Design a protein around this ligand. Structure first.
Ligand SMILES: NC(=O)C1=CN([C@@H]2O[C@H](COP(=O)(O)OP(=O)(O)OC[C@H]3O[C@@H](n4cnc5c(N)ncnc54)[C@H](OP(=O)(O)O)[C@@H]3O)[C@@H](O)[C@H]2O)C=CC1
Ligand SMILES: CN(Cc1cnc2nc(N)nc(N)c2n1)c1ccc(C(=O)N[C@@H](CCC(=O)O)C(=O)O)cc1
Length: 161
């Protein structure tokens, strides 16, 4: 099983503000969907609340230590190890956030699916400093701003070296 993390970063690795993402960029969610459909997705409790529903076409695994926390349509696990057990023998597990989960799983990640957005915005959550490790890019895509998406963004799939 490949352990992958997927995130969208504005400048200075900002990923979140006030439990939402501080930009309007609907097409980027389509990128997220293409990259995660058919795979188990593992997330922290705040990220689940931010999404607001189980996502279709994916096994939704949510981390919480709250013993009575049990949203419909997701599997709640109390440890990372248990998340990995729920994911089963699949090709690739996708960690979809948020900061605390990214922090705990970075050292173990085989791939990062990063979208970089050309935007300086204030944050209260940041992606980890992945650049402390070595990576090679194995896929990439560029997306210039258009009438529905006001910022340039690009995709980079990194593999740990
Ligand atoms: N730009 C992007 O790509 C993304 C941005 N985001 C943003 O990230 C932010 C959310 O990140 P953050 O606040 O760090 O929260 P998370 O989504 O990482 O949720 C953290 C919660 O998960 C639970 N938890 C964490 N680690 C463990 C563990 N090892 N075992 C069991 N439970 C655990 C705890 O919940 P409990 O207290 O219930 O135990 C904890 O408070 C939001 O602003 C969101 O919009 C999120 C995803 C993608
Ligand atoms: C807040 N959030 C988390 C989120 C958003 N963008 C990301 N973007 C990247 N690149 N990586 C992430 N981990 C990521 N996570 C959300 C919110 C909504 C939907 C959502 O409704 N997505 C639909 C597609 C969009 C839609 O249905 O309107 C899907 O099927 O994946 C997903 C993630």
């Amino acid at each position: 099983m490949i352990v992958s993390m997927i995130a969208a970063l504005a400048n200075n690795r900002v990923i979140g503000l006030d439990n939402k993402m501080p930009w309007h960029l609907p097409a980027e969610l389509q990128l997220f969907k293409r990259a995660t459909l058919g795979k188990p997705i593992v997330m922290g409790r705040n990220t689940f609340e931010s999404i607001g529903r189980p996502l279709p076409g994916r096994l939704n695994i949510v981390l919480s230590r709250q013993t009575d926390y049990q949203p419909e349509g997701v599997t709640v696990v109390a440890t990372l190890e248990d998340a990995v057990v729920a994911a089963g023998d699949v090709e690739e597990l996708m960690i979809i956030g948020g900061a605390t989960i990214y922090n705990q799983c970075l050292a173990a990640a085989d791939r990062l699916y990063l979208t970089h957005i050309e935007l300086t915005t204030e944050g209260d959550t940041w992606f980890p400093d992945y650049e402390q490790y070595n990576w090679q890019e194995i896929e990439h895509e560029s997306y210039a701003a258009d009438d529905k998406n006001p910022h340039n963004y690009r995709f980079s799939l990194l593999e740990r070296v």
